[PDB]
Design a protein around this ligand. Structure first.
Ligand SMILES: [Mn+2]
Ligand SMILES: [Mn+2]
Ligand code: NA
Ligand code: NA
Length: 327
DNA sequence: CATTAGA
DNA sequence: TCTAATG
């Protein structure tokens, strides 16, 4: 966490590098796992050789260790960190709609900056075309003070169309968090459960409203259960317009609400921890349900859930408020 | 890891 | 149909 972190970081740097810039899946994978294991090791790795003892720790990483150990650096790190083409990729990628593949592809075409990107709007896709267009606002955080104003409208339009809906804004937001980077709207409806062969219109109604009002300004991608877009709080009585926000609405079977909600809400460590627990308590957790374990080694059958409580009751745990699901 | 674009 | 990208 702090004793071995050093190694860790260069590792991931190392991994990330092969993974994006180059296309070395393998070495990438290889940087990672050692990266993992070195992480758990209970002592100061004092040498490559000592690390070397570790599984997935090869001659090639042990070597990386020593350069780093003796010299607080690593040329391979410096050489890259430097790499104008390399750096070039990593930057691009921040545009939303841009992955490793496009970054590389774009690069070679000579596009290695935001302006180039602009210059060539044509070679760009809707999604990225958006990402471009709000590049600034997307990287921007979201002051809860806004999360709340956003949340409020969501709920009202949600409600205005059909009284039967049920939305939830999960995550850190929910978790209480001062600022958030995107609002995640969990949504269900009773006329929609596991079987009841959809209702595409279910999502489309809302999306439809939100645009109707102006909250929704763009569609990153609108699917039959997952809409992806952006939204903007109506800029006041002037002098202060609002920043463009990534929004995410999605259709949930009413029969799985609470779990996904419980889940989506985090923290990645809260869940991991609970989920771990229920295992003991004779269960199985996961983004859509909670089933009971059969000694066979396995077993199913999704218990019924009416609120995050059931799930709580179920594993006979303490009702943890969203505020304190920190870990 | 599943959902969506797009080619 | 795949393969990229989001989360
Ligand atoms: Mn794309
Ligand atoms: Mn999100
Ligand atoms: Na080894
Ligand atoms: Na990106």
């Amino acid at each position: 966490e702090t004793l071995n972190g050093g190694i860790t970081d260069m590792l991931t740097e190392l991994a990330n590098f092969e993974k994006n810039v180059s296309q070395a899946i393998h070495k990438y994978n290889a940087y990672r796992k050692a990266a993992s294991v070195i992480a758990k090791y209970p002592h100061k790795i004092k040498s490559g050789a000592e690390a070397k003892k570790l599984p997935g720790v090869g001659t090639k990483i042990a070597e990386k260790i020593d350069e780093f150990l003796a010299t607080g650096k690593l040329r391979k790190l410096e050489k890259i960190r430097q790499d104008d083409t390399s750096s070039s990729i990593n930057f691009l990628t921040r545009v939303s709609g841009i992955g490793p593949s496009a970054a590389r592809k774009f690069v070679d075409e000579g596009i290695k900056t935001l302006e180039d990107l602009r210059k060539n709007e044509d070679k760009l896709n809707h999604h990225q075309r958006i990402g471009l267009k709000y590049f600034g606002d997307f990287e921007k955080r979201i002051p809860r003070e806004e999360m709340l104003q956003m949340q409020d409208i969501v709920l009202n339009e949600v409600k205005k169309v059909d009284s039967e809906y049920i939305a939830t804004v999960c995550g850190s937001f929910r978790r209480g968090a001062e600022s958030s980077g995107d609002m995640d709207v969990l949504l269900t409806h009773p006329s929609f459960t596991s079987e009841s062969t959809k209702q595409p219109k279910l999502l489309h109604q809302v999306v439809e409203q939100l645009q109707k009002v102006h909250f929704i300004t763009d569609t990153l991608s609108k699917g039959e259960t997952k809409f992806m877009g952006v939204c903007q709080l109506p800029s006041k009585n002037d002098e202060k317009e609002y920043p463009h926000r990534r929004i995410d609405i999605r259709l949930i079977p009413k029969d799985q609400y609470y779990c996904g909600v419980l889940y989506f809400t985090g923290s990645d460590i809260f869940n991991k921890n609970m989920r771990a627990h229920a295992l003991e308590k004779g269960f199985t957790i996961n983004e859509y349900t909670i089933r009971p374990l059969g000694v066979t080694g396995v077993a199913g059958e999704p218990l019924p859930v009416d609120s995050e409580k059931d799930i709580f009751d179920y594993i006979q745990w303490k009702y943890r408020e969203p505020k304190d699901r920190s870990e």
